[PDB]
Copies of this chain bind each other. A is one copy, B any other.
Amino acid sequence: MFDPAEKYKMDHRRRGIALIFNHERFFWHLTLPERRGTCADRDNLTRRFSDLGFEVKCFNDLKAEELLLKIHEVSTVSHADADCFVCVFLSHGEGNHIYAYDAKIEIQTLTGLFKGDKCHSLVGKPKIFIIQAARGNQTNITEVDAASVYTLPAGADFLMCYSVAEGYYSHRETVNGSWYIQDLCEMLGKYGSSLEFTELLTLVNRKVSQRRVDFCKDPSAIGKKQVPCFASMLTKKLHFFPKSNENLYFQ
């Protein structure tokens, strides 16, 4: 019965939830810079994921306790009537940690909450994480952070998506937002509803790698390329085809 073109089942009543944890400022005693532009990212993401049928829930500058609570909440709610789950971090990070407002959180513990064992409603459905996180270096300027967050995998049917890989650099325009998120969102706009999601993420890798970094306003920001990646542990093709909502309840 084995099928090389098998797709994830994306015919549930609702598409599912897209969390967006958005971090602009941090507690003084962490000594991390403002991520001026992260709001463009949040809004651009919010729009593109909405037009794909996600209930988008944004959360600005949560402390560790608040963040762990809101994400544990979402893991224990039923996704039984949902196609998939998306979770997005716009912050600083280091190694296997993302930064909340007040301290770092182990990424494995956030993905761990949606592992088949602990969230039955999502077993066999895609769990996509998107992570725009790097090291805080210290009108519209382009700021550049060094890659810092390990490009971890997660578990069966997870897709981990990363702004930048080891040895490369992450770019954020202070008005237009992160290079990764701009190009992710451009591709979501044009191709989200037709293309297989990893096919799309590959276009994002081209779009971002192709961005030139030879003629730069800061002389020290020259020759710092951005190459994003993704770690697929998906088992099927993933498409976000428009859902039929013609005389149906999808709330």
Which of A's residues lie within 8 Å of B, judged by CB?
Answer: 4, 6, 108, 150-156, 162, 165-167, 190-191, 195-196, 198-199, 201-203, 205-206, 209-210, 225, 227-237
Contact = CB atoms under 8 A, between A and B. Distances in A.
Contacts of A191: 4
A105 B38 CA distance: 39
12 contacts: A151-B152, A151-B153, A151-B231, A153-B165, A155-B167, A198-B202, A205-B233, A205-B234, A206-B235, A209-B235, A229-B232, A230-B232
Quickly give the copy total for this chain: 2
A70 B190 CA distance: 45
- What is the predominant secondary structure among interface residues of chain A facing chain B? loop
Contacts of A198: 198, 202, 232
Contacts of A227: 155-156, 233
A233 to B, nearest CB: 5
A233 B165 contact: yes
